[PDB]
Design a protein around this nucleic acid. Structure first.
Ligand SMILES: [Zn+2]
Ligand SMILES: [Zn+2]
Lengths: 115, 172, 77, 56, 107
DNA sequence: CACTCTACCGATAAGCAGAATTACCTCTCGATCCTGTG
DNA sequence: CACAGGATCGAGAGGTAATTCTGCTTATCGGTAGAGTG
């Protein structure tokens, strides 16, 4: 799940296989017959829910947008009195209403989760 | 929900200076809930059956699957996109070059009117003329079409990955 | 109008080659033709009173070549 | 509305009218009242047809 | 009366209506766990004999088809073991009169 | 005792057809050509 | 000098969104007991 394995030779991807002979896990391109050591204890992973720490893309020049409201919360890092905040950008009916404050200076993200 | 389609993305391309065409390219996801298929197939015009996007990408010159995956998603940290695209790359193994992609596309076109020697030309003409007839209608410009298809697939996946909202029909 | 005129203004029919090559178009002021053939300027009040059509004729250049302005219709204004 | 800020959940921005008819309405609550009236008219138009068919 | 546990075989259901005039009735344990007669929405059902049915038809001057019908597969019909042509009597309570009597034919 | 299809019903999944309140008022148009003839 | 009767629209395509909840019919699969053996 960390990264889909791609063959160094050619450009295809490496499905996974078992080296029981050496009782090991080896990823195989099975097109050009390229096999490496393939050292990883994870094969597949599925995530049922979505976390809250994803915030947003937080692209630079976020302060250039005038539609984002401004607040006066103190930044934990630089102790500034100016910042912008927005709700979580995950679009579902179960997401909470926690605000993600973004510091225009020092490029810091701090949430309002006082739980 | 009763329909076997979960999410669908389409663009109604048209020409503002040339003759009116109004050709609809429809991209739909067949993975209704946890059906374990999770396959996406586009709806090419004049072909009554839906072809997987990997064959279309190969027909545009993007033969390797890694290049297609890079085109679809521009970030490597979004592992969810790769997880949902894994069935597509697994189903794209039927075609391994441009020639077999064109053969597959042509075999799903005319009702066996003539041999396969004309199916390649049929697929080439269909993709050059009525495959997104708003970016370009000339030859040798398949990279732009592939990039736009990747952008459309990325938008569809983002909508299906509870990251955006369904587009509103009433927006003026 | 000019775009539609010079969009597909070529019908090749076949050293025997026939072409039409429609040229630029011309739009004149509204006019009315009667039985006696005399043509005069038509005004909206007269058109409304006489149940006529406030339309102006269309003229395009035709240059046929093998290897002037002509009437093609009236456009309401 | 474009005159508000993003992620605003205040009652005034979400369609709550504070003034009365005698005092007069601001443009925002005027638009909200127009939307409510449109919804009412549509409801009556659909309901009359459906009720007529059911009664028949 | 035969009571099974989970399901009934269609092959046995084919021979269920055999060996006349004896009648074989099949029931499920899950359906028989609770009693539906005791429900407050189910009124009392009283079976009528042949003479009673004839007297009712003569008094009200009705044919067999001119009566309310109850399916043979109805849960109450299965509970009472009603047969084709049998008339049942239903006593209910109304807000307009203290008691009301209704008759239905198993058709 | 399961070996291979033979006969049975129970679900599922796509295609058809209908049908959409009542009453009333006014205007405004359209009911045809051309290749083939003496 | 002049009139007459039969059929739109064509390979080509596609001239194209705004409706659904029944019920009927026609594919489809998904099961379950036997005709006699080693
Ligand atoms: Zn490889
Ligand atoms: Zn800061």
């Amino acid at each position: 799940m960390t990264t889909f394995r791609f063959c160094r030779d050619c450009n295809n991807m490496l499905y996974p296989r078992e080296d029981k002979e050496n009782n090991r896990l080896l990823f195989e391109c099975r097109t050009c017959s390229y096999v490496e050591e393939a050292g990883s204890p994870l094969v597949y992973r599925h995530e049922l829910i979505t976390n809250i720490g994803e915030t947003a893309g937080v692209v630079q020049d976020i302060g250039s947008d005038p539609t984002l409201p401004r607040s006066d919360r103190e930044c934990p890092k630089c102790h500034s009195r100016e910042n912008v905040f927005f709700q979580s950008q995950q679009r579902r009916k179960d997401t909470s209403m926690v605000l993600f404050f973004v510091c225009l200076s020092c490029s810091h993200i701090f949430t309002s989760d006082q739980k | 929900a009763p329909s076997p389609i979960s999410h669908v993305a389409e663009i109604r391309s048209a020409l503002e200076k040339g003759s009116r065409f109004i050709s609809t390219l429809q991209v739909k996801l067949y993975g209704r809930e946890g059906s374990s298929a999770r396959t996406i197939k586009a709806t090419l015009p004049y072909i009554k059956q839906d072809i997987p996007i990997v064959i279309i990408f190969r027909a545009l010159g993007i033969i390797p699957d890694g290049e297609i995956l890079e085109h679809i998603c521009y970030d490597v940290n979004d592992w969810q996109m790769l997880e949902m695209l894994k069935p597509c790359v697994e189903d794209g193994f039927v075609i391994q070059d441009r020639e077999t992609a064109l053969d597959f596309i042509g075999r799903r076109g005319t009702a066996l009117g003539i041999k396969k020697e004309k199916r390649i030309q049929y697929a080439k003409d269909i993709l050059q003329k009525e495959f997104l007839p708003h970016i370009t209608q000339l030859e040798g410009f398949e990279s732009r079409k592939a990039f736009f298809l990747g952008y459309m697939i990325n938008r569809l996946l983002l909508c299906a990955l509870d990251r955006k909202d369904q587009d509103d029909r009433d927006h003026f | 109008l000019q775009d539609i005129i010079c969009e597909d203004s070529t019908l090749i029919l076949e050293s025997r080659k026939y072409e039409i090559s429609f040229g630029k178009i011309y739009v004149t002021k509204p006019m009315v033709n009667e039985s006696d053939g005399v043509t005069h300027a038509l005004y909206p009040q007269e058109a409304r009173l006489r149940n006529l059509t406030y339309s102006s004729g269309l003229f395009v250049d035709v240059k046929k070549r093998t290897y002037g302005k002509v009437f093609i219709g009236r456009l309401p204004i | 509305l474009p005159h508000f800020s993003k992620d605003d959940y205040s009652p005034e921005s979400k369609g709550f009218v504070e003034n009365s008819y005698l005092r007069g309405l601001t443009p925002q609550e005027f638009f909200f009242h127009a939307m409510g009236g449109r919804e009412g008219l549509i409801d009556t138009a659909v309901k009359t047809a459906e009720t007529g068919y059911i009664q028949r | 009366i035969f009571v099974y546990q989970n399901n009934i075989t269609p092959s046995a259901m084919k021979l269920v209506p055999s060996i006349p005039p004896a009648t074989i009735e099949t029931f499920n344990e899950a359906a028989l766990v609770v009693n539906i007669t005791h429900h407050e929405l189910v009124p009392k059902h009283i079976r009528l004999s042949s003479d009673e049915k004839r007297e009712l038809l003569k008094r009200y001057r009705l044919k067999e088809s001119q009566l309310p019908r109850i399916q043979r597969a109805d849960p109450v019909a299965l509970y009472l073991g009603l047969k084709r042509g049998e008339v049942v009597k239903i006593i209910r309570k109304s807000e307009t009169s203290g008691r009301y009597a209704s008759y239905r034919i198993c058709m």
